[PDB]
Amino acid sequence: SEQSICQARAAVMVYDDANKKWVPAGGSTGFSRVHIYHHTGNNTFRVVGRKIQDHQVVINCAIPKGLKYNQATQTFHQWRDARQVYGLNFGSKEDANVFASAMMHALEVL
Numbered sequence: 001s002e003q004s005i006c007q008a009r010a011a012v013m014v015y016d017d018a019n020k021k022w023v024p025a026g027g028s029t030g031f032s033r034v035h036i037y038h039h040t041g042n043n044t045f046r047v048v049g050r051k052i053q054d055h056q057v058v059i060n061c062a063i064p065k066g067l068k069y070n071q072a073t074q075t076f077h078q079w080r081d082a083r084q085v086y087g088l089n090f091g092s093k094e095d096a097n098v099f100a101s102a103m104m105h106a107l108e109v110l
């Protein structure tokens with residue numbers, strides 16, 4: 001019942017609080033295809049990203065109502081979760097814009 005509403009090419013990262021540095025999500029360096037999925041049954045949204053080369057899922061995160069999405073630069077956006085900060089380092093400004101527009105839309109309708 002999940003349907004993709006966008007896809008963007010980005011390096012998915014998480015902030016390692018213990019070592020005070022960004023690290024590749026899933027320990028897997030390289031680019032992912034990152035979607036927002038809309039579950040129409042319960043009007044929920046999630047971020048799901050899979051490595052482009054090997055298809056491993058490296059991020060699967062809820063988008064709750066009120067999520068604060070920080071566009072730090074034209075190609076790096078980030079948001080908080082209880083466990084860690086997530087980051088998307090986009091391949092292009094246009095990838096970043098298409099993803100942010102889909103995120104904005106999800107946040108407006110939640």
Ligand SMILES: CC(=O)N[C@@H](Cc1ccccc1Cl)C(=O)N1CC[C@@H]2C=C[C@H]3CC[C@@H](C(=O)N4CC[C@@H]5C=C[C@H]6CC[C@@H](C(=O)O)N6C(=O)[C@H]54)N3C(=O)[C@H]21
Nearest residue numbers: 013015022068069070072073076078079080085086087089
């Ligand atoms: C008030 C508050 O806690 N605010 C949070 C942000 C926030 C605000 C509102 C809602 C949600 C969130 Cl999430 C916060 O300040 N956080 C999130 C944790 C992040 C960590 C470190 C420092 C290092 C300085 C900055 C940083 O990360 N920045 C600069 C752009 C820069 C661009 C790309 C990424 C790519 C990986 C790394 C690099 O290239 O080496 N890198 C970067 O180096 C990237 N920052 C942050 O950004 C920090």
